[PDB]
Ligand binder design. Sequence first.
Ligand code: FES
Ligand code: FES
Ligand code: FES
Ligand SMILES: [Fe+3]
Ligand SMILES: [Fe+3]
Ligand SMILES: [Fe+3]
Ligand code: NI
Ligand code: NI
Ligand code: NI
Ligand code: NI
Ligand code: NI
Ligand code: NI
Lengths: 437, 437, 437, 194, 194, 194
Amino acid sequence: YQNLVSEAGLTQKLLIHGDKELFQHELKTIFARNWLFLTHDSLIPSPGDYVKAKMGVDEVIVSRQNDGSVRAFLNVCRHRGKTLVHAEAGNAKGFVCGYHGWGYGSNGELQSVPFEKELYGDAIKKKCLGLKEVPRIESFHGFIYGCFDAEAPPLIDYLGDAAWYLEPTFKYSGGLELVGPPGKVVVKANWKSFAENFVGDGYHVGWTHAAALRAGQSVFSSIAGNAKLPPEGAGLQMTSKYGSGMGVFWGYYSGNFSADMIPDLMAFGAAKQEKLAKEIGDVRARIYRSFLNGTIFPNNSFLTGSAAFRVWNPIDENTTEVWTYAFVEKDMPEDLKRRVADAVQRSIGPAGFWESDDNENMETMSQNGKKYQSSNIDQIASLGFGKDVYGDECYPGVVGKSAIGETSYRGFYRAYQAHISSSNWAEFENASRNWHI
Amino acid sequence: YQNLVSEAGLTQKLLIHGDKELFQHELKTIFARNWLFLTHDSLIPSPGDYVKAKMGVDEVIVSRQNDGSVRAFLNVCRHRGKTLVHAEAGNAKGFVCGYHGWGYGSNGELQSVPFEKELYGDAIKKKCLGLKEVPRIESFHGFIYGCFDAEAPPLIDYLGDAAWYLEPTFKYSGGLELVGPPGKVVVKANWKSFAENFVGDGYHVGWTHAAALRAGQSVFSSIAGNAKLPPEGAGLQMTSKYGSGMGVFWGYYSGNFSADMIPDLMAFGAAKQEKLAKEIGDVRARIYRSFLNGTIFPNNSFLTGSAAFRVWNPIDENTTEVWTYAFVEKDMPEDLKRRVADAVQRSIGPAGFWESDDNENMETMSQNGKKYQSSNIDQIASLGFGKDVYGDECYPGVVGKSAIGETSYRGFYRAYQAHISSSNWAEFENASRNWHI
Amino acid sequence: YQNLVSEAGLTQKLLIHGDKELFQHELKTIFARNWLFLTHDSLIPSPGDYVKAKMGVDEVIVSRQNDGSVRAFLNVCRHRGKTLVHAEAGNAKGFVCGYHGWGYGSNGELQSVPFEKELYGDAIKKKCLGLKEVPRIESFHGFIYGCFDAEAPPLIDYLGDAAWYLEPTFKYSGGLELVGPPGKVVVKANWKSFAENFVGDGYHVGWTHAAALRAGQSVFSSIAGNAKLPPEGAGLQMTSKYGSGMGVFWGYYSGNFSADMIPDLMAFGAAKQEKLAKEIGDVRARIYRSFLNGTIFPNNSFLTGSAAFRVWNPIDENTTEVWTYAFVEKDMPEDLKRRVADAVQRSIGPAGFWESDDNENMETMSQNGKKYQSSNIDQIASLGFGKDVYGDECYPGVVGKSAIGETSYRGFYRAYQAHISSSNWAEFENASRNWHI
Amino acid sequence: MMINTQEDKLVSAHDAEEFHRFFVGHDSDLQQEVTTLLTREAHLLDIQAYKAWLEHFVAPEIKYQVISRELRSTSERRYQLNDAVNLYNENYQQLKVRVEHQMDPQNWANNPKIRFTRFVTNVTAAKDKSAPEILHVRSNLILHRARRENQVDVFYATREDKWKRIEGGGIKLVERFVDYPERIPQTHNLLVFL
Amino acid sequence: MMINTQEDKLVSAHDAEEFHRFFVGHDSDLQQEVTTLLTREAHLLDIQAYKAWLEHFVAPEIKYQVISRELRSTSERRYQLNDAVNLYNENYQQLKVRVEHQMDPQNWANNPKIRFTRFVTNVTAAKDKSAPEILHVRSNLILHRARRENQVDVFYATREDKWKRIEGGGIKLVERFVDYPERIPQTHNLLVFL
Amino acid sequence: MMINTQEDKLVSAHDAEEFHRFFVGHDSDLQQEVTTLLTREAHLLDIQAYKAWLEHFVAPEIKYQVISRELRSTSERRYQLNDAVNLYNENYQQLKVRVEHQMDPQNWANNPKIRFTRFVTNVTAAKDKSAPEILHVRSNLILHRARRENQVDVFYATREDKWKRIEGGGIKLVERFVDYPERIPQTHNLLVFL
Ligand code: FES
Ligand code: FES
Ligand code: FES
Ligand SMILES: [Fe+3]
Ligand SMILES: [Fe+3]
Ligand SMILES: [Fe+3]
Ligand code: NI
Ligand code: NI
Ligand code: NI
Ligand code: NI
Ligand code: NI
Ligand code: NI
């Protein structure tokens, strides 16, 4: 697995998007090790609320505890291994297994065992039979992540330089809410194909989405046909030590939404921008009302403005279960929140007309990685190469001067290669000592 | 494959129900080595009668010979390897291959070869081109088993201590008939999931089948909700050297049948019990009219009373072709036989309402064994552990005092682990020298 | 992979038609190395015309160049690896990638890159990013083949002794045209099952197709039931160094066509035969109007007379995408050409009634190769063994005196075994030094 | 319109006769009436109103039968063991038991609520020639069942029914017979009301 | 014909009421008329005449809504967060945008031309009891979509419609609602007009 | 009701005209008659009464044609090689040959007996404007074929037919055309009468 990504993340073997054995290896070195998105506070707001989530191929119950904390457990009974919960979300003080009737608390503890007194006696120790717990649960402004590896860096350190870019929308805007339920659909593409598209693909917008731009008159109509750069400038792209990265298209708060959404959204963002400039400064207040497209390593992607939150849940090397949520700013009028929620699905949900265009790209790439001759072709991530900077006075991380660029592809794949060639976090750290140089 | 089952069969890695490579290994160490159920005399009663059966993933033609014996052959032409027979059952004195017309006898001998004289001459030796025969064919009171391994113990020795428990129904009741054709359906679960459920799962009945018990008013309504043990007592469970085992629920001759079957079946069983007590004694005559649930290692399961005979035919690590027959006592009135046959399918056939409940358990267990994190969770088979006996004056084998127990799970998995860690029968024997201690 | 085919190609392990790992190995040693059929001149007759074709599991664009030559390229963009072309055939001077808009010429050169000046500058070298080209493209009388291995023998040398048999129809008849589009259908059989059936299976015709012979009254009705050899004689079968081979049924110009096609086709062939005898001699003029069934190694098969051209495109070890074209002699009346084209599909296309019979054989053979016990059964290719000759004064190659024979099976499988046990062409040559002895 | 079973070698005597029954029994008014009946029945089943179905659409004397036929050679004759297993062969009480199991809050398989969609086509009907209150009905069904996020099972069947007119205007099922076309269903089970 | 939702434990109040609506609303003439309407609509969509569909079959006030319902426990009550996401929830302008995207020569996904086949069954209709110009219509749909040589997706749905009679004789769709039965479609997307 | 093919960019001239044909040709009596005809035809085929079908439902002058269309770019023009292969293109004698092959006791593929179920929907009809004895008929078909325990193939098609009224009251097929929607069927073959 040593030479799948070249130096500086410049090239990737197409095989990575189709190889079966590599997928198995990723379940060990990517999904067993990294922070994975679970849910938002707003989806489990009250004690006993739970959602099912996937962490890689595994399923977990994510439960609001009586003390207000959140714990998550593999969705598997400790007796004979039956799946415990079949609802996608709900409220419950405990979970009873339908096979033999073992009853667990929302804290994962084994509480009740039918025939315990009559048949088990001292042959059972319930304290040893609690649900298998996810050992690390942390949040970033309400967004809750889990990790199977107790040695992982804290979530905030894992976000690294990416956190600074997220803060105007995620931290300083007065609170976000994730609007459920998510759209869910299965797509015949590798999880990495979506992850790379969202981490940094500004280049595709004007070409892949030419028809969508004409029909809906999105603000992105400026780059239609890849003929001209945005009048606002080429934007930015950044990447970070642990692989997260994103592009910034200045001012594009309505993102991939159609013309009917633009006036009201732009007015809302412009008004808050004016307030925010006094608190966090002009540049960051502008970031607040710009379009950010990114990936929180490995498989959680987002758009700001046309506010979307996505999980590329791996099923196998050629199959992904795609989850799509909208998010809203807490202080938006309720009617605007509802319009945003519908508009996200309209563009990129299971019946999203932009999503149709994107999927057209994702599936064939992944299919070609499965084919013997074609799998040896390199993908190239050369756009902006040789011009990225580190230690800029204004913009942290490794930064390029264009959202149409592959700065964040290179950072994503560097981190990916470091993980697949490492057995643990300490080895990843050694492999990443010179990540910015 | 060494540490998949712990000492005394106490725990099993959940992975065993989902691992692809292990399934391949089982085709070598389980299905190539052990006795596998083929058919009953009553389904091939006359010369030339045949049935197709599966032995693991392979298909065999099981044929009643002119001299009254039974022989079985792989369903594969010796010329270019085309499948020879496509009917599930029939009567024929020979089998002709539809590709080039080679004709075999029901004894597997190559008899006719088109263009033999004109084109083959001495370039063919028909004696060397007979169908590939199953080398071991034996029966237990009409139930015919095959084995690919010529070194296998005799079938009666393989049944071991389990035979004693089967005899009241199978031997002493005046003859059984298997009622065909079987129900057949594909279920997305590992073959072992069904095998363990049938070998010893009395514990699930009152919980998994709570709704079915309420609706049909089966005699098993006594243990509904796993609230109380049967008034007749906890029953028995046993296991044996070569892995076969079963539970006994005293008196429950109508088993999983609904109230409309109970009076007539109970009257029939009670009447024969009175006669049998004089021949085989009180305890064994009671066993005759009790409910036994068991597995004849590896993948043949049965219920007595609500009389069912099942084969869990493996397709892959996550897929099983489930066959369900009824059996009847030969001296039952013909109308009762017909009612029993329908009642078996009504409970546990492809449209069986109890089967729906059981399958709900089988599929997810097996699915969880495929998932990276979840596959490392242990199944535990601790119920009754530390209280099993060997050498009891009345009940042979390794025996526990409850049909709600995991005595027979432990014996099944011990034998399983011994087989997967052995290359031949001699190695299995060495690994099983202290099976009861 | 060393002992899958026995000495002289006499036996083959049935496993070869079902083994997953072997299929992967074939993509390296068979499909990466050998000549594979692409298209005919008549399907890309004008500059800019292209067809998609498969070469093994890979897809290629086969394009008529402005200078009249033909070049072929993997159907994969050099940027992020998206499939470039989705139409099966067309005319175009270039191919634009729908993801980011990179534009290639029909010569494979990268010509246009959106934002090249603004964003790439010297970070891109277009000369290094042309489509991945198939390095070897050669034809045999209009039939165009490709090879991934630059070290391959010239196509004419690869056809070896088979070329002599093909020439009366392919070279001396005044030109053939391939009639598109092909029928396409997926069949659940290994590619080799079809290849062996077409390379030499005269034996199946009278048995497998008994019903079709009765219904349509094909000239092959002479061998119905495998009761009698053709009155014209047993025919011929040949094989060659690089694996190609075929049978000859004398005089049977209407092949598998029904009675309604026979008078007009026979009259056309008889008339040209009379002319051809003066140019190429009596024997070869008779071959021109005989039925040849063969395979051009590895996976291109043909029938003359009832003129068909087939590709067994591998999908996996148990799945093949079957392509079926008709071919016609250029100087046939246009109405006869249309009748031939329809008649080919009527017999062996996706709704072909003979094809239904053949597929019945192909699928089960391949299925049996997947099954543990059955996969160890040998296929035997013994028909005519010990009577083949080399260096005959009239008929070149290794030749047997019957089209109902397995001469060409033996040669096909010898070449197959030599390839799978070799790393390159030089090793194949060493393994084939005594191919005829 | 009759079928000559000597020339039509694949047609059973049973199927030939039924074809003739439905050919000569065509009546435009009856076709409309029975199409409405079967559409109502399918709607009721799709929304899982099993008690309303059993009470209002099913007669006390119901025989509800679905068989799986063992695959036998067309050309052999001799083997005369029963060739059909009853996947269903239910009287009214047996249907009641099944209905109560479907609706029980502790039927674990039915939580979350499963989704059914039924497509009824090719309806034909014929009044019985002896018992005019009896309507013979043939119809083809596609049944789509979705559950548990990504489980989808599609069933295909021909229902051969006898329905009976009731005093008051209702019509109730007295027999449904299905010869299920797949010998080994690959739909996990056949626990659906066809 | 009414459903007793206390005894029929699986039936929602909503579904029980709709069943009754369509039961009592049966009219033979209306059934024929609406069957023709839906067949014409499906034909127009199958040949991809999306502009003709939007102009002639869809009313200016259209609400075109397809939901995916989160799977919740039948037995819990407490969790009251919205259980439905709108895969479609379109007004006329939003449909216009989608139509223009479908037809644009630079919609890369639509080259080569995709193939649609629609099967409409189980049609029922009822005139609204207040607004007689409004027709409530229920129908089941199978939609087959084939593209790119070997891609086949089959969609299954129940369409709950309101149609409105227009001055001049036409009938136009004012609401279509679909509760899509598969929570996670395995059809690559749901970018089809149900 | 007409389609403007300049605005409706995805619609072929051919499809636009056919849509109009079936729109204006609507007749309630004809709809009922043709629905019965197609239901009878499908029943006969499902029970494998191929000789009765060929004799009684198919005219001597039959053209029975099923094409597979090569996938071409919507935007290119120049490439003019024939884009369709005839999977079927049969006259009466050619159908007779196929029928006799289906029924032959030595058709090895047909033992054990295969199971067919046909679902016909979306029937429309129009009398020809010149030849009133000719009925243009469109209908959609789902065909389910089950064999060999676990083989299931489902076919989806639109049949574009011309039927002819016969002296005596019968109606026989003079042309059936199917543009098969899957370019590469994944049903093992297409050896079914659509
Ligand atoms: S598997 Fe959960 S209680 Fe037994
Ligand atoms: S494969 Fe059986 S006779 Fe040839
Ligand atoms: S993948 Fe082709 S232009 Fe980017
Ligand atoms: Fe996009
Ligand atoms: Fe059970
Ligand atoms: Fe053949
Ligand atoms: Ni019948
Ligand atoms: Ni009621
Ligand atoms: Ni509703
Ligand atoms: Ni118009
Ligand atoms: Ni047409
Ligand atoms: Ni007749």
